[PDB]
Each structure stands twice: as C-alpha cells, then as structure tokens.
Amino acid sequence: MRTLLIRYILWRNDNDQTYYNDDFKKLMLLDELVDDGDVSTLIKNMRMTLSDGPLLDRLNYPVNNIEDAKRMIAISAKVARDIGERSEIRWEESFTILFRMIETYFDDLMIDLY
Amino acid sequence: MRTLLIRYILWRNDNDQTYYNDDFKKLMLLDELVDDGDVSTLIKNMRMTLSDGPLLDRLNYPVNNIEDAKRMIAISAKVARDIGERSEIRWEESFTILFRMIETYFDDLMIDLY
C-alpha cells in the first residue's frame, strides 16, 4: 500500500505513461470525495507561498475514519495533478505525513479498493 | 531526479515489471561501486534489529563527491533489492536522508548518467 500510493501520487504529477499501472483506476475513484474548489484554493496558496506548506497543512489534519484517509489520498492525488510536474516538491516529506496519518488504514483501504 | 530515484529504489524492492523504465538500466550500472559483502552485512544487521536503522546509519554518512552520491544510490538500490518486498520499511524516511545528502548532485548525476 505504501509503495502503490507513492507510485500513484508521483504518476498523478507527471502523467508519465511508462509509470502507469491499472491499480491506479481504483484509486482514481477516490477523487469524487474531494471538491475541485478546495484543490484550486490549496494550489493558489502553494503558489502564493512558493512551497508545499499548504499541502503539508492539509495532510496534518486528523484522520479519524477510512473516509478521512480516502480523502487525504484524493487531496494528495488532485494537488499532485494540478500543481504541475515542473513543481520542485520534496514529495517524501508529503508522503512522511500522509502515511503517518493513513498507515493504520492500509489493510482496510486495500480490502475496500481490491 | 528525485522522482526517478524514488521510482528506481521502489522497483529494486518488488521487481514488478509493470513499474520498470529504461532509465533504470543506467542507474543499475552504479551497483558495481558497492561491494555485495557490505550489503550482506547491512541486511544481516537490519534483520538482527528488525529495523531500517542500519540502512539509515549508512545513509547518514557524509557525501563529499559525486562518487559518494553514486555509492549512496547503489547501497540504497542493493539494500532495497536484498531486503525483500514483504519488508515493512518506511521508504520515505530513507528517501528523506538519501536526498538530504545527494540533492545537490542531481544536476551532475543526470548529466553523468544521461
């Protein structure tokens, strides 16, 4: 789950066909859980501050249920997409926080998705 | 370079052909720079301690030249390979340290490799 999620988020960023996998299709369904307006707001802030700061702030939100986790994956995915591949983001820092929150839900997320 | 290296190390760990890229061939040539005996020693220690601790210790070594960086990538790659896919390693923590040391060499590593 850790690997798959890293691979998926990175893929959402650059859209490199050479790194696409069909397991991404299921994870892509989680996008409906996140409003595009929230993503736009987040991107605007990231650009305003020239940092992943606003993304890390969103990732530092509490995760109390699997739906909360699904949303964090989706927000990471849509931000990754919308920010653009040129964006010099230290992705491992975002993954550190994302997984710090969602790690426990990995077993259930895997069942829920596949 | 950050993305490519994340993708390469993760690929070395699971050997999933669906995540392979031709750019990995060049990075695989760096393996000659690292002795297999050092890797064996490191793996033995990781297993002894049930942690990535010994890997993180190796990654915390100083990087004074591009060859030092090339070796850190190679040690990360061979450890990733030899440890096995089942290994519950928080890869992002290893990437945090690896990139903390090698980040500056990214531009030169890219030229040197491609």
Author numbering:
A (entry chain E), B (entry chain B): 1 to 114
Give passages from the manuscript:
VACV protein N1 is an intracellular virulence factor that is expressed early during infection and modulates innate immunity by at least two strategies: preventing apoptosis and inhibiting NF-κB activation. N1 is a Bcl-2-like protein that contains a surface groove similar to those in cellular anti-apoptotic Bcl-2 proteins that bind the BH3 motif of pro-apoptotic Bcl-2 members. The VACV Bcl-2-like proteins N1, B14 and A52 all form dimers via a common surface comprising alpha helices 1 and 6 (the ‘1–6 face’). Biochemical and structural analysis of these mutants demonstrates that the anti-apoptotic activity of N1 relies on a hydrophobic groove on the surface of the protein and that the anti-NF-κB activity requires an intact dimer interface.
By analogy with VACV proteins A52 and B14, which have the surface groove filled by bulky amino acid residues and do not inhibit apoptosis, we introduced the bulky residue tyrosine at positions R58, Q61 and R71 in an attempt to ‘fill’ the N1 groove and thereby exclude BH3-peptide binding. All three mutants crystallized in the same space group as wild-type N1 and the overall structures of all three closely resembled the wild-type protein (0.21–0.39 Å r.m.s. deviation over 108 Cα atoms). For both the R58Y and Q61Y mutants, the tyrosine residue protruded into the groove in a manner likely to reduce BH3 peptide binding. While WT N1 and the groove-filling mutants (R58Y, Q61Y, R71Y) were all dimeric, the I6E mutant was almost exclusively monomeric. Introduction of the groove-filling mutations R58Y and Q61Y abolished the ability of N1 to prevent apoptosis, while mutants R71Y and I6E inhibited STS-induced apoptosis as strongly as WT N1. In this assay, both WT and I6E mutant N1, where the groove is intact, interacted with HA-tagged Bad, whereas groove-filling Q61Y mutant N1, as well as A52, failed to immunoprecipitate with Bad. Likewise, when untagged Bid was co-expressed in cells, Q61Y mutant was unable to interact with Bid, whereas R71Y mutant, as well as WT N1, still immunoprecipitated Bid. In contrast, mutant Q61Y which has an occluded surface groove no longer binds Bid or Bad and no longer inhibits apoptosis. Expression of WT N1 decreased NF-κB activation significantly, as did expression of the groove mutants.
